[PDB]
């Protein structure tokens, strides 16, 4: 398992990277912290409108302007 | 409209130079020459080393066109279920590859 | 056969392509987004016998929204009206139909 | 309400107009010069709007 | 006359058939499909279709019918045909290729026009530009979803290939 | 062939038929029925002999054309409906083309012109797989679209069907296309009472592949293609020999053997539905089906006997081959007809 | 129905007729088979463009690959007919007459 | 260098993204009198 | 010695510096001093064809400022 | 103004590709310890204007064609996809700035098979038609890992943008974070125009006359300047001052110049591959390590969130 490592890496290296950048390839997007970034980032990309919301009376955590407090804030993508 | 354009021209090049290239010199009255190559009369036969490439080829690009849209399958919210499928087709091309090579396919052309 | 697997199991294997209604993209809208919601909402459930004779003029505005054949015939009966006026010198087209006029916005 | 927003965009840029012509026109001389028309060509224009916007209004 | 371009094309599709579905030759055949698939594309690259006619060239055109005329070419034992001086050799090409567009040219009659007329769609038919779409083609992101909605499609489509490569090495064996 | 490989083909051409017989969706069904034909498509060349690949090539042409035609009819329902529901067909040219689809791939006639072919020229299992397992999808296809499909149109191709895989079985010493035209035949049969009542359409498909699965299990069993090579059973196994002959006098239509359960109970149905002429014409074809296949049981059971020597030889050795459900088959191919009300199982 | 609609139908029934006529060659069968598929292409794709269905583009690659896949297949079946006969002609495929 | 890169044009995405954002109720204002506009005048010219 | 190549590149390399020279003062040319409006988008296309409407001379690269607003 | 403009595109490149033969001649010449040609004008200046004239009145060979059209519809076809390539080609704003450039480019350099295919059964000879289908099967061969480092590397553009790719390479070359891509794009490329020590066809369009082999002579050399240039705009994407084009089309221009003498200096220095070890080198070298490198550039912007944007 290690002898024989080191015979294919003598004999076919290009296998031996094909191999293992496809097993890093596989394996790293999930031991990776940045993976969440990636999917943080793609859904705060804004393709349409956001479209408002008729204010009944009682929703806190919904701003009246985007200048407000409350509501989804990229301040993590402007510093990272 | 300009593609269209550009196009045209294109092809009236090509076809401007391609008969400048016939008709300048039969100008010439040259000779008018007769008596008409590794084979003489010999007929051809098929190969069959040939058609595996070129079917493997197309099977490939098959996969390849699958694999086309994802510069813009990267913009996705589910990117989980989008890396899964990208390595999932890339690994069944690569698996095909494997089995184009166990069984003696790439011999002789490898 | 008709062996209902998705529904038995509870997976999504082919549903989201079959109408135009469900789930787009960036949420795209079809061109025939609410005709075709109010044909599947009154022909729900009722079957398929009872939903040809009882929801008829909601598929045939889904129908005339998708193949625009009354439309079309509708523009072809006013175009050719206009065309027969041109002709006979009886008519006159206007200025914001001939282009002299510096659109709107 | 569409007549309303161009009842508001209007006393928008008249606003504009009245303070910071000069300033506005310079920025949106160099947004104007560009095919995708980038607001990453145009920083230190960018700078001297948001500075006098800041300032007069 | 610029209105009615896809309309024009597509009668141009038909008699591109007519060029194959008669059946020459294979390779004539293969000539006239190749034809017919560029026209068909700039019907559908005419409805902002792009990268579906894309792959109408990358992948129908470039990628399969290459491999038709491949296997065409590694069969139907060849012959000569007349090679005259310049006066047969490309004059010929020239008189036959002008004579086919004024078959094209030709169609366009008055048994054409109480079709077209009457039943005018360039003014109301092509309606992809109906209002704005945004900053993407809804098409490419519709071919994009591929990978997050089709995920059963994918994996049917991907198994078929692999099944495709292992029952084409199957069948060309001869053992 | 590589025998995984050849599991893993088997198991393709299953899940091309179980994903045309889940689907919600047209695009399915059209990917469902090509998988199946790409897939099946080496069964019948396991031999690799010129007459597996001209049957192949047949197979492969019919099947297209019905798979194109296929696609054409649901382009049409997505033009006239916007949508993708497997359900009825919202044009009658649509329905027409899925209809005549739908017939090319079950080989009805008059689009039947390959069936007696392809199954000659390939081997006896995959002759077995072409007439049971490939008739599951498009006969589900047509249960699931059957409030578009023209009435005219389906006992036009269900009585031509009929009668030309009876007049079929005359001219023929060939088991293999005595048993296609017993497909033709019985697919008419079974489009015959689908717009009345697709229960006895399930019930006439599931005895027919269990008849049909006994006739080729026994034909493998045997190692015998022709008539004239039928004949020798009597002196090689005399178990043998009954056992196909009861099972095609079950095929034939008769009773009391579970092969008349399914006509019987088509007729149960049509002359409920007024038509009384109809299963009357058909039945008495399923008679000259009865007049052909009785003088093939003649062939067998009694007069054209003779042996060779080389016989005696063969009595010295067992059959060593897998007859596979075949003792259960022969039990449900005869003596099913007293649970004939188990049928209310398939609605 | 409609005109453009029209005209790719009338091509795929011009190709249907090719594909049920033939003259010498198997490759003339598969070129109209291949031919039907590249209208069926062009017929789902312009309504599928025209109706703004988002999801079904998706859906004419997809009758493109297993088509095309199918029209390998087909290829593969002629060069064994070639490799027996030498020639592609549909009548040297007359053998399952009996 | 392609992830702060690829990082600053997605951000640089998203400024577009709401300039388009901050701009759509105009434009769509605009869009709606621009198809009334029209459809009054094919209304008028299809009564005359 | 090595540097007799030199000209048959620069004949070469001016040969390859035309094309976008020329496409690059043909697109300043054309448009008002300015770049080619690009228009790979629907929105990109709405904007360019409200600034041709908003011009009065049916060219969209006519910028009105606020000049053009009382 | 349009045409201008497609003129100054179409005519420049047929003087750079004559003006090829040249360059190659002469760095042929001292790589091989001779000089090349400096007899006919000054330095040789003039030895392309008497190559073309002389091969464009030199006698048709009067060809035993097996068909008129496909004999006349090659060259035809060869010349116009070999033009019609540069089309979408950033410097540093294309003549057709389009959506798709990228797919379009790969779309007409995988149609330009038929040129070959063409050639070939539009003669006589068993033999060349043996060679037009090595060759084509080679370069259909070499189109699909063409594709794959094409999708490798524009899952880090954001879309198939010629002119995006400008945009994307603006803080470091791509040739840093792509480079196994690189150097096996630079051999598919080398192995697509039949360039050595891939040139199995001087090791199939000898049927034509002289003047139609000059014009599949400088279609083949077009492609070769073209695909330089592609290659240059992929991965080695240079400066950009909106306000300056001039800069960016001189720093192309003369990276493309270095690329080009690259594949002129790469000509003068390898013995030719045998067909099954380029065939060997395709499937099983360049194949694995291509789709391994597929897999990561997919993965990759995921797990560094560096995916780049869409428009
Ligand atoms: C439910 C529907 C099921 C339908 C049938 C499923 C099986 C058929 C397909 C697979 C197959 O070929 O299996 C071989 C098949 C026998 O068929 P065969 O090869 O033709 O038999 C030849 C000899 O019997 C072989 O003899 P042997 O010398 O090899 O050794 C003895 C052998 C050894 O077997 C064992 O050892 C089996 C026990 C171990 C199983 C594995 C454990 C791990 O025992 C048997 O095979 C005895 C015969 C078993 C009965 C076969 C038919 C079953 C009933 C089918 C449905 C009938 C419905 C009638 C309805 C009527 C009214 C409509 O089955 C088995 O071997 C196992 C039987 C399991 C029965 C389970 C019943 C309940 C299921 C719920
Ligand atoms: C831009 C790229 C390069 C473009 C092409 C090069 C530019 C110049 C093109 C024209 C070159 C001259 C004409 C072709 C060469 C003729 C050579 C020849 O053998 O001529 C004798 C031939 C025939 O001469 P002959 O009558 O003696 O015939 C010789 C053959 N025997 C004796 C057996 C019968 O002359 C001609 O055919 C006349 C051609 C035109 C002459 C010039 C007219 C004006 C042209 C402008
Ligand atoms: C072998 C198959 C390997 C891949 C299996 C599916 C992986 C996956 O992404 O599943 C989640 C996906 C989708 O889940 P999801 O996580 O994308 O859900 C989010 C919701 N949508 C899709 C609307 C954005 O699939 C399923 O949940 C069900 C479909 C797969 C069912 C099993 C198929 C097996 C085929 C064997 C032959
Ligand atoms: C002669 C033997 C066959 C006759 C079978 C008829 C049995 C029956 O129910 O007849 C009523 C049916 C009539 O069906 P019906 O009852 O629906 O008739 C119309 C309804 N009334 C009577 C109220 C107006 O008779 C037939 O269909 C006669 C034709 C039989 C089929 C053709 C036989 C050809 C020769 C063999
Ligand atoms: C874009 C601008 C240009 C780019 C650069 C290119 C310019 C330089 C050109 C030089 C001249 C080329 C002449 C022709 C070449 C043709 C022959 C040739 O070289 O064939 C290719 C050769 C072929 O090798 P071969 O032919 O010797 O192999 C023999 C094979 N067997 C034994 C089976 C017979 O090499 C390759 O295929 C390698 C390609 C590049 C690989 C890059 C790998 C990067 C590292 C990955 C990770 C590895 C470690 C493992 C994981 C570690 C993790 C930490
Ligand atoms: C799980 C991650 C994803 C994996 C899938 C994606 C992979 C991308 C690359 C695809 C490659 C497709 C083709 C692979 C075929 C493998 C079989 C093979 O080549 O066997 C033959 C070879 C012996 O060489 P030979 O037969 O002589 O070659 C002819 C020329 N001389 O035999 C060999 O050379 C041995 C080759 C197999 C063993 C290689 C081991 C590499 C280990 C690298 C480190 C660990 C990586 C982690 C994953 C484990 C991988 C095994
Ligand atoms: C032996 C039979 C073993 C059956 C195992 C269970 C399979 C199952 O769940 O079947 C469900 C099916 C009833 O499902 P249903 O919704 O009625 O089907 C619609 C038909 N178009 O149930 C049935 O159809 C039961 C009868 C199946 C008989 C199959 C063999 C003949
Ligand atoms: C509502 C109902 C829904 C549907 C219900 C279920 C429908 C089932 C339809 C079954 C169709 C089966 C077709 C045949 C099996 C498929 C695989 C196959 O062919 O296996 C046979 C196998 C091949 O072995 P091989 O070595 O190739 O033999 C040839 C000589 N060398 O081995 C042999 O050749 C050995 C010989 C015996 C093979 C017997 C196979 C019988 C299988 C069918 C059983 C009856 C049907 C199922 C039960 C009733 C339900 C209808
Ligand atoms: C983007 C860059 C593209 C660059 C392309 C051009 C590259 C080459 C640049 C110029 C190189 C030198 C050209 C002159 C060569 C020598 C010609 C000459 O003088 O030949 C002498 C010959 C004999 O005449 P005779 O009078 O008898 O001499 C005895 C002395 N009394 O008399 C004659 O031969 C007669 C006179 C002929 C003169 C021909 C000169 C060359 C024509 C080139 C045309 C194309 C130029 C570029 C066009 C596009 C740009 C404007
Ligand atoms: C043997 C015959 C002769 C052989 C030599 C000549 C023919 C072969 C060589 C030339 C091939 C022609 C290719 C034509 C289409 C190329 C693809 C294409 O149009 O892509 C560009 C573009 C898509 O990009 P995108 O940015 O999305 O579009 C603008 C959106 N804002 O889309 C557009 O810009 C769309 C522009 C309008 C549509 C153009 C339609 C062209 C005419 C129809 C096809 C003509 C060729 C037919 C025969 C082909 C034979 C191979």
């Not at chain 3, 549903?15 to 061109?31: G, K």
């Not at chain 5, 086919?100 to 530009?129: A, Q, S």
């Not at chain 10, 033999?127 to 370069?139: E, F, H, K, M, S």
Request: proline residues 5%; glycine residues 6%; hydrophobic residues 50%.
């Amino acid at each position: 398992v290690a002898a024989f490592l080191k015979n294919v890496w003598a004999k076919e290296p290009v296998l031996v990277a094909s191999f293992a950048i496809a097993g890093l390839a596989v394996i790293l997007p999930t031991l990776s912290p940045y993976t969440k970034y990636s999917l943080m980032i793609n859904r705060a990309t804004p393709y349409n409108y956001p479209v408002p919301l008729r204010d009944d009376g009682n929703m806190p955590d919904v701003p009246s302007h985007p200048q407000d407090p409350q509501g989804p804030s990229l301040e993590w993508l402007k510093r990272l | 409209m300009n593609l269209m354009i550009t196009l045209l021209t294109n092809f009236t090049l090509a076809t401007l130079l391609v008969t400048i290239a016939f008709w300048l010199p039969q100008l010439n009255v040259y000779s008018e020459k007769t008596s008409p190559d590794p084979m003489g009369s010999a007929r051809l036969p098929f190969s069959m080393k040939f058609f595996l490439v070129a079917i493997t080829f197309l099977l490939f690009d098959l996969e390849i066109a699958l694999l086309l849209p994802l510069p813009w399958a990267s913009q996705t919210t589910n990117l989980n279920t989008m890396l899964t499928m990208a390595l999932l087709l890339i690994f069944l091309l690569a698996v095909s590859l494997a089995y184009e090579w166990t069984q003696k396919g790439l011999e002789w052309t490898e | 056969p008709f062996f209902d697997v998705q529904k038995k199991l509870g997976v999504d294997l082919d549903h989201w392509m079959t109408i135009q209604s469900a789930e787009q993209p960036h949420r795209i809208p079809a061109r025939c987004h609410a005709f075709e919601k109010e044909w599947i909402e009154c022909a729900h459930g009722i079957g398929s016998i009872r939903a040809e004779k009882e929801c008829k003029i909601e598929f045939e505005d889904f129908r005339e929204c998708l193949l625009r054949q009354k439309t079309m015939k509708r523009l072809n009966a006013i175009k050719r009206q206009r065309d027969k006026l041109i002709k006979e010198g009886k008519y006159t087209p206007p200025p914001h139909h001939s282009g002299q006029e510096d659109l709107r916005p | 309400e569409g007549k309303l927003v161009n009842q508001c965009a209007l006393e928008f840029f008249r606003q504009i107009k009245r303070h910071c012509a000069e300033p506005f026109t310079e920025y949106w001389t160099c947004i104007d010069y560009s095919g995708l028309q980038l607001f990453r060509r145009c920083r230190k224009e960018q700078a001297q709007f948001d500075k006098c916007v800041l300032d007069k209004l | 006359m610029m209105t009615y371009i896809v309309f024009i094309l597509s009668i141009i599709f038909v008699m591109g058939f007519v060029g194959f579905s008669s059946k020459p030759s294979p390779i004539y055949g293969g000539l006239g499909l190749i034809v017919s698939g560029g026209v068909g594309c700039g019907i559908v690259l005419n409805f902002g279709g792009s990268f579906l006619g894309l792959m109408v060239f990358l992948i129908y055109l470039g990628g399969m019918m290459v491999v038709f005329g491949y296997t065409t070419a590694m069969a139907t034992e060849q012959y000569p045909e007349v090679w005259v001086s310049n006066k047969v050799v490309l004059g010929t090409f020239i008189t036959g290729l002008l004579m086919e567009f004024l078959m094209v040219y030709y169609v366009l009659k008055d048994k054409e026009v109480e079709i077209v007329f009457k039943f005018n769609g360039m003014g109301d038919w092509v309606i992809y530009d109906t209002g704005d779409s945004g900053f993407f083609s809804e098409e490419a992101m519709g071919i994009a979803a591929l990978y997050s909605y089709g995920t059963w499609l994918v994996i049917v489509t991907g198994w078929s290939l692999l099944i495709g490569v292992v029952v084409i090495m199957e069948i060309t064996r001869g053992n | 062939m590589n025998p995984i490989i050849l599991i893993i083909i088997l198991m393709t051409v299953m899940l091309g038929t179980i994903i045309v017989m889940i689907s919600t969706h047209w695009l399915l069904i059209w990917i469902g029925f090509e998988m199946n034909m790409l897939a099946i498509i080496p069964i019948m060349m396991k031999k690799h002999n010129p007459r597996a690949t001209e049957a192949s090539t047949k197979y492969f042409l019919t099947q297209s054309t019905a798979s194109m035609l296929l696609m054409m009819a649901i382009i049409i329902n997505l033009m006239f409906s916007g949508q993708w529901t497997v359900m009825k067909l919202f044009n009658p040219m649509a329905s027409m083309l899925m209809t005549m689809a739908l017939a090319m791939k079950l080989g009805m006639a008059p689009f039947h012109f390959w069936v007696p072919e392809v199954t000659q020229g390939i081997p006896l299992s995959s002759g077995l797989i072409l007439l049971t397992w490939q008739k599951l999808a498009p006969m589900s296809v047509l249960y699931q679209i059957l409030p578009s499909i023209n009435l005219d149109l389906i006992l036009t191709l269900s009585i031509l069907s009929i009668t030309i895989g009876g007049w079929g079985g005359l001219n023929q010493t060939q088991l293999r296309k005595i048993m296609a035209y017993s497909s033709i035949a019985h697919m008419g049969w079974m489009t015959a009472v689908l717009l009345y009542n697709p229960t006895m359409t399930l019930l006439n498909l599931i005895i027919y592949i269990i008849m049909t699965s006994t006739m080729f299990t026994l034909f493998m069993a045997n190692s015998t293609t022709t008539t004239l090579s039928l004949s020798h059973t009597w002196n090689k196994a005399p178990i043998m020999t009954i056992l196909v002959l009861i099972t095609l006098l079950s095929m034939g239509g008769l009773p009391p053997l579970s092969g008349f359960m399914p006509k019987w109970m088509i007729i149960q149905e049509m002359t409920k539905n007024d038509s009384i002429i109809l299963p009357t014409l058909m039945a008495i074809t399923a008679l000259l089906n009865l007049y052909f296949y009785m003088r093939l049981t003649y062939s067998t059971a009694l007069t054209m006997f003779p042996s060779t020597n080389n016989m005696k030889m063969k009595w010295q050795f067992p059959t060593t081959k897998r007859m596979t459900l075949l003792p259960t088959m022969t039990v449900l191919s005869t003596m099913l007809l007293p649970l004939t009300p188990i049928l209310s199982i398939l609605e | 129905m409609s005109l453009v609609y029209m005209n790719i139908m009338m091509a795929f029934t011009v190709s249907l007729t090719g594909l049920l006529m033939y003259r010498s060659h198997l490759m003339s069968s598969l070129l109209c088979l291949e031919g039907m598929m590249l209208s069926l292409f062009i017929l789902a794709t312009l309504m599928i463009l025209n109706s703004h269905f988002t999801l079904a583009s998706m859906m004419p690659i997809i009758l493109l690959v297993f088509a095309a896949c199918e029209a390998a297949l087909g290829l593969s079946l002629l060069v064994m007919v070639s490799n027996t006969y030498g020639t592609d002609y549909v009548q040297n495929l007359n053998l399952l007459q009996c | 260098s392609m992830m702060r890169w690829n990082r600053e044009r997605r951000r640089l995405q998203i400024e577009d993204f709401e300039a388009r954002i901050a701009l759509m109720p105009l434009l769509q204002a605009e869009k709606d009198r621009r198809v009334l506009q029209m459809l009054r005048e094919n209304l008028e010219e299809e009564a005359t | 010695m090595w540097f007799e190549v030199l000209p048959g590149i620069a004949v070469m390399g001016v040969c390859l510096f035309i094309p976008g020279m020329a496409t690059a003062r043909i697109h300043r040319f054309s448009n008002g001093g300015r770049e080619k409006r690009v228009a790979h988008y629907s929105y990109q296309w709405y904007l360019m064809e409200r600034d041709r409407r908003v011009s009065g001379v049916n060219r969209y690269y006519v910028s009105k400022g606020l000049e053009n607003i009382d | 103004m349009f045409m201008i403009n497609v003129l100054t595109l179409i005519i420049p490149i047929l003087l750079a590709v004559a003006f090829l033969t040249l360059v190659e001649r002469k760095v042929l010449g001292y790589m091989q310890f001779r000089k090349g040609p400096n007899v006919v004008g000054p330095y040789g200046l003039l030895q392309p204007i008497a190559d073309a004239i002389k091969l464009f009145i030199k006698e048709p060979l009067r060809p035993a064609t097996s068909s008129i059209s496909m004999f006349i519809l090659a060259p035809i076809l060869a010349l116009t996809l070999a033009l019609t390539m540069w089309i979408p080609l950033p410097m540093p704003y294309p003549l057709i700035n389009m959506n798709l450039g990228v797919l379009f480019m790969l779309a007409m350099s995988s149609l330009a098979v038929y040129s070959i295919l063409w050639s070939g059964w539009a003669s006589n000879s068993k033999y060349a038609l043996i060679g037009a289908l090595r060759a084509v099967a080679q370069t259909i061969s070499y189109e699909v890992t063409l594709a794959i480092i094409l999708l490798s590397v524009l899952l880090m553009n954001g879309s198939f943008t010629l002119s995006t790719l400008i945009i994307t390479q603006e803080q470091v070359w791509l040739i840093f974070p792509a480079w196994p891509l690189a150097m096996m794009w630079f051999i598919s490329t080398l192995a697509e125009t039949n360039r050595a020590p891939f040139d199995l066809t001087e090791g199939f369009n000898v049927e034509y006359a002289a003047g139609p082999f000059a014009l599949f002579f400088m279609a083949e050399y077009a492609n070769i300047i073209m695909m330089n240039i592609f290659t240059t705009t992929l991965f080695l994407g240079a400066f950009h001052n909106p306000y300056m084009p001039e800069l960016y089309t001189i720093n192309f221009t003369i990276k493309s110049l270095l690329l080009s003498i690259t594949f002129l200096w790469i000509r003068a220095s390898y013995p030719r591959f045998r067909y099954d070890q380029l065939m060997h080198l395709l499937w099983k070298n360049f194949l694995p390590l291509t789709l391994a490198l597929c897999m990561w550039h997919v993965s990759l912007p995921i797990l560094l969130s560096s995916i780049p944007p869409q428009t």
